[PDB]
């Protein structure tokens, strides 16, 4: 349970960083 | 358990939206 | 529990593929 919460959080962190990288790419492809 | 399922689903939703944004960027960088 | 671990892993896999696609876009927007 605690390790599963850990694993969920590792995913949440990866998502957070992906969102920020995507946002950078979005800006660079934008007019 | 139910809240953990919730949290997993919040991640799944964030991923879904990231995938669609990535796809938009992929198209805009494509020839 | 086992299915929840499954679901977490489905998210981890989606994230992995998103990270690689983002990286491709990052390179294509880079100088
Ligand atoms: Cl997750
Ligand atoms: Cl992207
Ligand atoms: Cl993601």
Beta strands in chain C (DSSP E): none
Contact A26, B26 (CB under 8 A): no
Q: How many Cβ atoms are within 10 Å of A6's Cβ, its own excluded?
A: 10
Alpha helices, DSSP H, located in chain C: 2-29
What method was applied to determine this entry?
A: X-ray
Backbone conformation region of residue C30, classed left if phi is above 0, alpha if psi is from -120 to 50, else beta: beta
Cα-to-centroid distance, A21 and ligand 3 (Å): 10
Shortest distance between the Cα of B31 and any Cα of chain A, in A, equals 13
The tokens for A11 are: 């995913």
Q: How many Cβ atoms are within 10 Å of C25's Cβ, its own excluded?
A: 24
How open is the CA angle A15-A18-A22, to the nearest 5 degrees?
140
Pick the residue of A17, A25, A28, A30 with the most B CBs within 10 A to test the interface with B by mutation. A25
Contact C29, A29 (CB under 8 A): yes
The tokens for C2 are: 């086992």
């Amino acid at each position: 349970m605690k390790q599963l919460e850990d694993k969920i959080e590792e995913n949440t962190s990866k998502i957070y960083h992906n969102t920020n990288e995507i946002a950078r790419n979005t800006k660079l492809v934008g007019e």
